[PDB]
Symmetry: D2
Subunit: 125 residues, 4 copies
């Protein structure tokens, strides 16, 4: 069993009101769905990612990351976001992340292809 398999698995909410539902596998897998409260998005989108299933025991958080491609049965925003961050357990559990959102562009517009931001996920909104 991954050290934080149980801690990570479940439903998380960010500061924008988005919903991230994930299952963490014993050997580092992350599968789930993401629903964005903002942007060119509707309903749930597949996500997959990875996490460190054997983190340091020194009080450090647990490194993880995942991707959503913004295509589902309702919409295609020709874009993909990746979240990179760490899970922190305890009464105030939180997944703190930075993210990159890249659109498909022409070569001429590629300089402006990628947004950066930060999302913090909590178990209760």
């Amino acid at each position: 069993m991954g050290r934080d398999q149980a801690g990570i698995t479940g439903t998380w909410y960010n500061q924008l009101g988005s919903t991230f539902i994930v299952t963490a596998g014993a050997d580092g897998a992350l599968t789930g769905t993401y629903e964005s409260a903002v942007g060119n998005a509707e309903s749930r989108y597949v996500l997959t990612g990875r996490y460190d299933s054997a983190p340091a025991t020194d009080g450090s958080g647990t490194a993880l990351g995942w991707t959503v491609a913004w295509k589902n049965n309702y919409r295609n925003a020709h874009s993909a976001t990746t979240w990179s961050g760490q899970y922190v357990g305890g009464a105030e559990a939180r997944i703190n992340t930075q993210w990159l959102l890249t659109s498909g562009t022409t070569e001429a517009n590629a300089w402006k292809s990628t947004l950066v931001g930060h999302d913090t996920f909590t178990k209760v909104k």
Copy 2:
């Protein structure tokens, strides 16, 4: 079949000499392995991600992203990188990406948890 399922699937090399081997599924899945030429890494690491299986037909690239957690049978660097970018087909096919590498840290060191960079992947090194 994803528009670029065939274009994406295969072996890619970046400017550092890293090797990314990926299979793109018809409905947006990315699975594979990553071997880093640099950092606290040895041999192959699992990766998963997503791509836009129906990109714009206007000459735009194809949005995609993936994650590696830097734990395998040889090492655990308590970290995860996500690559966010776009695939561009044609004689000079390339996956252009920006990435975020987050380590597990204490809360005191969390301000310095995350590296950012950029990798460009080609079919021949």
Copy 3:
């Protein structure tokens, strides 16, 4: 007079307990000092930057950015941070920012030269 010359000029504090003291000039200049509560830093460091002295009047924030090179009379951390963000006026005035911290490295270590994060600045801590 810059629209937010008065709003921006003064002392700001971030979530880490750092202190940013800045003067905004009528034609877009930012000068001041920065004192970091964290990292390889002691006392004040020079900063300079720029801001949009004629922002949109539609309720948008005011774009701005500044740099600190982490060399002063006490220390040299061979690094520089740039903050890019927007100032938002009103009872809850805030400067919201993302930042890049680049160290001087050898070419071999250049892939790991740059940290990314986010600071939010307030008028009262």
Copy 4:
């Protein structure tokens, strides 16, 4: 005299065909102008920044950063870019950078306020 005062001062060109003209002061100052080959920009824009005037002598590059607010006598793009990077001397001198471009936005659009990219500057294009 800053170690790389002479090396940095002058005209640089990036991969997009932009022109950066800068003067480095003996005590870490950077002043100059920037002309973008892309985006909502015309002619030169003021820039200011900082650099490490006493870098490591171990072959490491020289940390530096600067800002442009995208307002001049011709246009106002209500935005500011900061470049964070390192200067590398020698026959192939280069300033390697990552950058953040923040627009002024409403609070509702703030999640999409900031672009990230990377520019490499050379002495000859």
